[PDB]
RNA sequence: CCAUAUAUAUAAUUUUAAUUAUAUAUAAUUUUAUAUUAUUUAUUAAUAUAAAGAAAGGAAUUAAGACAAAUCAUAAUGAUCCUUAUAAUAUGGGUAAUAGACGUGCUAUAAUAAAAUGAUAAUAAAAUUAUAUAAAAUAUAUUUAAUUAUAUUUAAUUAAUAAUAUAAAACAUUUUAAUUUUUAAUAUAUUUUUUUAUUAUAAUAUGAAUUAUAAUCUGAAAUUCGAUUAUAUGAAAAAA
RNA sequence: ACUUAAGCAGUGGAGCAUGUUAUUUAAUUCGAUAAUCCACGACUAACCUUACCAUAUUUUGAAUAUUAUAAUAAUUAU
């Protein structure tokens, strides 16, 4: 577990789900609460269905909220489960995470944060 | 950028402690100080902008700027409004 | 100590005038600490978090081509219907 | 009587119970009336002012409802709503603090 | 309030209707300071359950209405 | 992994605490040599004596059974019950009542012990300060000042910078009821802050409960029911 | 071998504070009860906290969903 090498030890920063430091403690508490609420929302967002009898339950880990000076990055792992010519539901979900032009989730979260 | 920077001076780590009734928890604030010398304001603004753009997760930053220079109310604005209200103006 | 009090009073008055300070040699209660007290309303009010959060019900309007499922809500409805099958459901609320 | 409180107030985004709603309502109305309360208090507490003005200000202070009082606000746990053993550093009761701290939810917090 | 420079703890009261029609003033304001002009007037002060009727004297002035409506049974 | 000891790095040694800070690494679970005792005979162990060492502490880390626990406030699910009320809001009241009984703590019941005083300021650590913190000064209690408590005014600092905050016991002098073991008047002295002679000369100057009066503090509000100060009051508490 | 026993150092008959219990109370919110003992949480109960009492007052209420209406913005062809 060599600490001097970034391939041989887990950064201690990674054993917290919210990774942040604010000089303004009020804002840090607020950001922690925001991360917990968004994690609960994302958990709610991982179940989909293509009409009845077509339930799809994506399983995501806890979110990892990387707060830097000018950006927040919400990283999470997930597990799911001719295809070139349509988008399945999981693809639509992820594309609303980042790629939609009008009401993608990260813009709404940017306003929230 | 051409800036003389002394180095990340270790500053005292702040310890915060909490007792749960006897489980102990603590949080450590690590602090580094980098000082800049003999530089123009504009180059130093470039430094701050660049390092802000490419900052790391979980690190906060405070910047003090020292600029050598040549020598050369909500309550109050409401108290006036209340005193110029009929309820208070009638007693005066 | 030997300095006359008039000299120090003149110094205090002139200094207070320069630095925009209340000069109150009589020591009367002026309520100035009330004026100078900070407003704590915003920090106190933001205690429980930002209320303008995205909620599950908004998802139906933002992303109509995705039909999300709230497992908790579906379970609550299933339990409500299961009770109503046994005759253990809530009575009809009285109305005026 | 659609809303239990006189003034419509948005709900907090997380855990809810009746006591959290009561506390949140009082916090919102304290924010809204803080300047008025401070101005009235200043008028009441300024001995340069006439006694009638001070008495009128004190009367208006006593006439205000309970949901504008700063002393009525109580810090509750944002996760469980409990009002005992709340750590202000996280707005959590001690049990919720321990749970979240062991889950890694609280940034920087470690077992000692 | 308690510090004398702050003045009495005056509260709103239906006193004029009791100063013209001689009716009792029913109040839950147990913290109200009895002012000198309350003298003679009849009060009905809440004790938490009932309204103790009293008539204000000059010996009560300065005291508070709640002092004359005890809230707990003695035994 | 802490801590401890050491090395390197960093700090333009005015954010100074370089006697420091915090990153990285090293170290020990110590080792060697004799002598005496025992020995499963040494290449063992203990004791002692030498030698080299700064080296002497601590924490965490897995399961399996048994019983308890609904402030299980360590949850979830289910069942059951209320639905104009067992849900919800406001005003006031209570949780502070007092015959007892007990647990815990604080202050005491005096001389190996209490008090007062000690300014170029004896000597700390660890924390806290944007939902603050309050310096110095001035004014009143109040008495030359100091001390203590409030008020006035808010300097600096959102902090290795400024403030809370000159740590306190310690130590030194003085004082101290019971105690005629003392004080005082005269003499007296080579003990002079003192000696000697002759004359007079169970609760305190311990304790601080209770209560009265007047102020103050926070708060919109101190009545039930808060805290502080001053002037009075001055209880119980001695033995086993 | 927890425990006991021994030794050392204390504390321990009063006042107060704080809990529990008993009684009281409109309420004194809640906590034990198969015979040694033991109902006993407070990182702060004036209002809030609060759970309790009295009196007033609210009635789809804090949620999600359905169905209507009344507006408000976007789009069709009014
Ligand atoms: Mg409070
Ligand atoms: Mg004494
Ligand atoms: Mg109460
Ligand atoms: Mg109430």
UniProtKB/Swiss-Prot annotation, chain B:
The keyword Ribonucleoprotein applies. It is found in: Mitochondrion. GO terms for cellular component: mitochondrial inner membrane; mitochondrial small ribosomal subunit; mitochondrion; small ribosomal subunit. The modification Phosphoserine is found at residue 85. Disulfide bonds: none annotated. One of its GO terms (biological process) is mitochondrial translation. Keywords: Mitochondrion, Phosphoprotein, Ribonucleoprotein, Ribosomal protein, Transit peptide. One of its GO terms (molecular function) is structural constituent of ribosome. It comes from the Eukaryota. The keyword Ribosomal protein applies. Belongs to the universal ribosomal protein uS10 family. Component of the mitochondrial ribosome (mitoribosome), a dedicated translation machinery responsible for the synthesis of mitochondrial genome-encoded proteins, including at least some of the essential transmembrane subunits of the mitochondrial respiratory chain. The mitoribosomes are attached to the mitochondrial inner membrane and translation products are cotranslationally integrated into the membrane. Present with 8480 molecules/cell in log phase SD medium. Component of the mitochondrial small ribosomal subunit (mt-SSU). Mature yeast 74S mitochondrial ribosomes consist of a small (37S) and a large (54S) subunit. The 37S small subunit contains a 15S ribosomal RNA (15S mt-rRNA) and 34 different proteins. The 54S large subunit contains a 21S rRNA (21S mt-rRNA) and 46 different proteins. This is Small ribosomal subunit protein uS10m. The gene is RSM10.
Curated annotation (Swiss-Prot), chain C:
Keywords: Mitochondrion, Ribonucleoprotein, Ribosomal protein. It is found in: Mitochondrion. Its main location: mitochondrion. GO terms for biological process: mitochondrial translation. Belongs to the mitochondrion-specific ribosomal protein mS33 family. Component of the mitochondrial small ribosomal subunit (mt-SSU). Mature yeast 74S mitochondrial ribosomes consist of a small (37S) and a large (54S) subunit. The 37S small subunit contains a 15S ribosomal RNA (15S mt-rRNA) and 34 different proteins. The 54S large subunit contains a 21S rRNA (21S mt-rRNA) and 46 different proteins. InterPro entries: Ribosomal_mS33. Coiled coil: none annotated. The keyword Ribonucleoprotein applies. This is Small ribosomal subunit protein mS33. Component of the mitochondrial ribosome (mitoribosome), a dedicated translation machinery responsible for the synthesis of mitochondrial genome-encoded proteins, including at least some of the essential transmembrane subunits of the mitochondrial respiratory chain. The mitoribosomes are attached to the mitochondrial inner membrane and translation products are cotranslationally integrated into the membrane.
From Swiss-Prot, chain D:
It is found in: Mitochondrion. Component of the mitochondrial small ribosomal subunit (mt-SSU). Mature yeast 74S mitochondrial ribosomes consist of a small (37S) and a large (54S) subunit. The 37S small subunit contains a 15S ribosomal RNA (15S mt-rRNA) and 34 different proteins. The 54S large subunit contains a 21S rRNA (21S mt-rRNA) and 46 different proteins. It comes from the Eukaryota. This is Small ribosomal subunit protein uS14m. Signal peptide: none annotated. Belongs to the universal ribosomal protein uS14 family. InterPro entries: Ribosomal_uS14, Ribosomal_uS14_CS. GO terms for cellular component: mitochondrial inner membrane; mitochondrial small ribosomal subunit; mitochondrion. PROSITE patterns: RIBOSOMAL_S14. Keywords: Mitochondrion, Ribonucleoprotein, Ribosomal protein. One of its GO terms (molecular function) is structural constituent of ribosome. Coiled coil: none annotated. Component of the mitochondrial ribosome (mitoribosome), a dedicated translation machinery responsible for the synthesis of mitochondrial genome-encoded proteins, including at least some of the essential transmembrane subunits of the mitochondrial respiratory chain. The mitoribosomes are attached to the mitochondrial inner membrane and translation products are cotranslationally integrated into the membrane. GO terms for biological process: mitochondrial translation; translation.
UniProtKB/Swiss-Prot annotation, chain E:
The keyword Ubl conjugation does not apply. It is found in: Mitochondrion. GO terms for cellular component: mitochondrial inner membrane; mitochondrial small ribosomal subunit; mitochondrion. It comes from the Eukaryota. Keywords: Mitochondrion, Ribonucleoprotein, Ribosomal protein. One of its GO terms (molecular function) is structural constituent of ribosome. One of its GO terms (biological process) is mitochondrial translation. The keyword Ribosomal protein applies. Component of the mitochondrial ribosome (mitoribosome), a dedicated translation machinery responsible for the synthesis of mitochondrial genome-encoded proteins, including at least some of the essential transmembrane subunits of the mitochondrial respiratory chain. The mitoribosomes are attached to the mitochondrial inner membrane and translation products are cotranslationally integrated into the membrane. Belongs to the universal ribosomal protein uS19 family. Component of the mitochondrial small ribosomal subunit (mt-SSU). Mature yeast 74S mitochondrial ribosomes consist of a small (37S) and a large (54S) subunit. The 37S small subunit contains a 15S ribosomal RNA (15S mt-rRNA) and 34 different proteins. The 54S large subunit contains a 21S rRNA (21S mt-rRNA) and 46 different proteins. This is Small ribosomal subunit protein uS19m. The gene is RSM19. The chain holds residues 9 to 83 of 91 of the full protein.
